[PDB]
Amino acid sequence: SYTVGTYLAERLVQIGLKHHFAVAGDYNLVLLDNLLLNKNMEQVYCCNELNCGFSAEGYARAKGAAAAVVTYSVGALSAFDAIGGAYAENLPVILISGAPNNNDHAAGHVLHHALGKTDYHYQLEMAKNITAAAEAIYTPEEAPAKIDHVIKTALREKKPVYLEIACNIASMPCAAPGPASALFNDEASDEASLNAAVDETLKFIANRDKVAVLVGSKLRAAGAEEAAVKFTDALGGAVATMAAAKSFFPEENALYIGTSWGEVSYPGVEKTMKEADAVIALAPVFNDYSTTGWTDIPDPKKLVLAEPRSVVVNGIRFPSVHLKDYLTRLAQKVSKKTGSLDFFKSLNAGELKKAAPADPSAPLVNAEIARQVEALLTPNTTVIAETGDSWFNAQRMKLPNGARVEYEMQWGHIGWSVPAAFGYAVGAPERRNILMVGDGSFQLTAQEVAQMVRLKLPVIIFLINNYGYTIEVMIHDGPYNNIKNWDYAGLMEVFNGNGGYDSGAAKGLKAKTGGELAEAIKVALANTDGPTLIECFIGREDCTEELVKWGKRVAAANSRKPVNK
């Protein structure tokens, strides 16, 4: 019959996982054995649990959901940072922790890996703060219901969930899992509300000429990217993407006008948004960074707020209205309103100004790195863009339809990109997978490139070596922004370990000129058997113009004085 462990394994396969990620520990080893019995998915190992969590986060970006398996307390507490990250970025990551033998509860027993006390609910209680569901399993009869509950919750809420499983019950028998269709069972839109939300939107824009659409970073979580284009093509108004929504709308679409991000918007976009009579915001996240230090907030009286599962429009709130349905029906009924796009064109603001190819023997500069990476973009490419100036470099790139950008702009844990790129490339090996990561960020999680070597993943890594934390320098500078430099190129042979117990096919190259970068890229593209790290040398102050302006607003928001209470 099924066991607690194989029940969990079958449910993971049923929701579409082809892989799950893990770090062994004595509290989870039997559970890992059970998961390995299901040959419809592979078990992938990680260096540490923070990286294991972020690897699952990256895999969920590629495949829609993911799972990570860690040991009690010492494994789960660090993995919590990555699970909070999954919560912040709306990804269904299932964290499963091994846990104490079920005889040790209420027994006055002190156990290894715990705090030295005799009670073991602290980890579960901590996990409730950063998950949508969190269940401890102490007996085998309780497992099927707790597993089904947390997996249904993760999928319908697009949030991470927690499970712990007593180490001595992982191989115990339980009931068999029913059909997979039950796991995707979710509310439909309330018919009357859906129709009323659509109707009130038509009423709201009936006498408004300039209707602009602002694409937000929960659009994919709502499963509404295709429906958005149906609507925007019907409307014919100007469409802009918020920074974190890059690649959630087609940039070669005739109505696309570029990035909306306050004073670091593409030319003409800020003025177009300001002059709109109505802004239809599709699942946006308005926080201190996306509003450019609270300087760029949508006019409340011009706003139609279409979240994933509700619409606020014309002064009325509509719960139980799914964004995909709302956009699809609105697309069928809306009239053609081109005024916002006419207005944008009338500014004659031109396209984003980009640098021409550098003299190849001149010293490398940031703009030349960005040009050559941008030239690699195809319909089959994904760029993983780390927190740092890589945010702003990636934002400036024109995406061919189908090309994807992965951003972690809400959580913003530097170092996320390395393990996230590993997990993503495991989930989508058919793609050209590019990682843009700063030197400062790289040092927090660099060891996961060794797993890329191990699984022969041809990830192209652009390591931006500007000697320190340049985005922090452009917010508020001090001696804490300085780091110890590494030979980053040389680290690839360290992870290969050729002549040691195993081998690898990673390559590490240095680029100090445009010519050296172009040559390194050719070698990277030809290396199909392992990752290629290109160490790019540029000055600390050689950064985007956008970062300089945005960093000043962030610094001011963070330090603004207390108000009188």
Ligand X SMILES: C/C(NCc1cnc(C)nc1N)=C(/S)[C@H](O)COP(=O)(O)OP(=O)(O)O
Detail the residues annotated as belonging to a binding site for substrate: 26, 113, 472
Work out how close the CB of 338 gets to Mg ion at its nearest, in angstroms, rounded to a whole number.
44
Residue 305 per-residue DSSP state? E
Decide: is 565 part of the binding site for a copy of itself (CB under 8 A).
yes
Distances (CA, A) of 265 to 358, 375, 386: 25, 22, 20
Q: Which residue has the tokens 């918020």?
A: 242
Comparing CB distances to a copy of itself, the nearer of 256 and 422 is 422
Looking at this protein, which amino acid is placed at residue 37? L
* Identified binder of ligand X from the candidate list 92, 100, 293, 438, rule CB under 6 A: 438
Decide: is 439 part of the binding site for ligand X (CB under 6 A).
yes
Question: Can you spell out the DSSP letters for 118-165?
Answer: S---HHHHHHTTS-S-EEEE-SGGGHHHHHHHHHHHHHHHT--EEEEE
Interface mask toward Mg ion for 455-494; x: CB under 5 A: -----------x----------------------------
* Identified binder of ligand X from the candidate list 140, 250, 388, 530, rule CB under 6 A: 388
How far from chain centre, in Å, is Cα 474?
A: 24
Q: From CA 512, how far away is CA 518, in angstroms rounded?
A: 11
Residue 555 binds which entry of a copy of itself, ligand X, Mg ion, none, with Cβ cut-offs from 5 to 8 Å by kind? Answer: a copy of itself
Decide: is 23 part of the binding site for ligand X (CB under 6 A).
yes
How far from chain centre, in Å, is Cα 311?
A: 24
Comparing CB distances to a copy of itself, the nearer of 430 and 502 is 502
Decide: is 176 part of the binding site for a copy of itself (CB under 8 A).
yes
Interface mask toward a copy of itself for 366-405; x: CB under 8 A: ----------------------------------------
Q: From CA 33, how far away is CA 18, in angstroms rounded?
A: 17
Residue 285 binds which entry of ligand X, a copy of itself, Mg ion, none, with Cβ cut-offs from 5 to 8 Å by kind? Answer: a copy of itself
Work out how close the CB of 469 gets to Mg ion at its nearest, in angstroms, rounded to a whole number.
6
Binders of a copy of itself in range 480-499 (CB under 8 A): 480-488, 490-491, 493-497, 499
Q: From CA 214, how far away is CA 260, in angstroms rounded?
A: 8
* Identified binder of ligand X from the candidate list 389, 406, 448, 535, rule CB under 6 A: 389
Neighbour-count burial of 457, counting CB atoms closer than 10 A to its CB (0-12 exposed, 13-18 middle, 19+ buried): buried
Interface mask toward a copy of itself for 106-125; x: CB under 8 A: xxxxxxxxxxx-xx-xx--x
Q: Are 424 and 404 in contact (CB under 8 A)?
A: no
Q: From CA 462, how far away is CA 524, in angstroms rounded?
A: 10
* Identified binder of a copy of itself from the candidate list 179, 206, 207, 361, rule CB under 8 A: 179
Binders of Mg ion in range 428-447 (CB under 5 A): 438-440
Work out how close the CB of 470 gets to Mg ion at its nearest, in angstroms, rounded to a whole number.
5
Comparing CB distances to Mg ion, the nearer of 147 and 471 is 471
Residue 18 binds which entry of ligand X, Mg ion, a copy of itself, none, with Cβ cut-offs from 5 to 8 Å by kind? Answer: none
- Planar angle of CA 30, 75, 494, nearest 5 degrees: 100
> Looking at beta carbons, which residue is closest to ligand X?
438
Q: From CA 80, how far away is CA 70, in angstroms rounded?
A: 11
Decide: is 440 part of the binding site for ligand X (CB under 6 A).
yes
* Identified binder of a copy of itself from the candidate list 18, 226, 252, 319, rule CB under 8 A: 319
Phi-psi region of 351 (alpha: psi -120 to 50; beta: other; left: phi over 0): beta
Comparing CB distances to a copy of itself, the nearer of 14 and 340 is 14
Neighbour-count burial of 356, counting CB atoms closer than 10 A to its CB (0-12 exposed, 13-18 middle, 19+ buried): exposed
Binders of ligand X in range 36-65 (CB under 6 A): 49
Residue stretches of the annotated binding site: 26, 49, 113, 439, 466, 468, 472
Q: From CA 67, how far away is CA 427, in angstroms rounded?
A: 12
Decide: is 233 part of the binding site for ligand X (CB under 6 A).
no
Comparing CB distances to ligand X, the nearer of 28 and 38 is 28
Interface mask toward ligand X for 368-387; x: CB under 6 A: ------------------xx
Q: From CA 191, how far away is CA 198, in angstroms rounded?
A: 11
Comparing CB distances to ligand X, the nearer of 428 and 446 is 446
- Planar angle of CA 472, 476, 480, nearest 5 degrees: 65
* Identified binder of ligand X from the candidate list 13, 74, 234, 312, rule CB under 6 A: 74
Decide: is 470 part of the binding site for ligand X (CB under 6 A).
yes
How big is the chain by its Cα radius of gyration, in Å?
Answer: 25
Which two tokens mark 261? 């991000």
Work out how close the CB of 537 gets to Mg ion at its nearest, in angstroms, rounded to a whole number.
11
Q: What secondary structure, in 3-state letters, does 480-537 show?
A: HHCCCCCCHHHHHHHHHCCCCCCCCCCEEEEECEHHHHHHHHHHHHHCCCCCEEEEEE
Comparing CB distances to ligand X, the nearer of 344 and 469 is 469
Which two tokens mark 83? 């699970």
Q: From CA 474, how far away is CA 497, in angstroms rounded?
A: 38
- Planar angle of CA 22, 28, 34, nearest 5 degrees: 85
Decide: is 466 part of the binding site for ligand X (CB under 6 A).
yes
Q: From CA 520, how far away is CA 376, in angstroms rounded?
A: 13
Residue 31 binds which entry of ligand X, a copy of itself, Mg ion, none, with Cβ cut-offs from 5 to 8 Å by kind? Answer: none
Residue 104 binds which entry of Mg ion, ligand X, a copy of itself, none, with Cβ cut-offs from 5 to 8 Å by kind? Answer: a copy of itself
Residue stretches of the annotated binding site for thiamine diphosphate: 49
Q: From CA 433, how far away is CA 383, in angstroms rounded?
A: 6
Q: Are 562 and 515 in contact (CB under 8 A)?
A: no
Comparing CB distances to ligand X, the nearer of 49 and 406 is 49
Q: From CA 384, how far away is CA 76, in angstroms rounded?
A: 25
Residue 37 binds which entry of a copy of itself, ligand X, Mg ion, none, with Cβ cut-offs from 5 to 8 Å by kind? Answer: none
Decide: is 203 part of the binding site for a copy of itself (CB under 8 A).
no
Residue 364 binds which entry of Mg ion, a copy of itself, ligand X, none, with Cβ cut-offs from 5 to 8 Å by kind? Answer: none
Binders of a copy of itself in range 452-471 (CB under 8 A): 453-454, 465, 467, 469
Contacts with ligand X, residue ranges (CB under 6 A): 23-25, 49, 71, 74-75, 386-390, 412-414, 438-441, 464, 466, 469-472
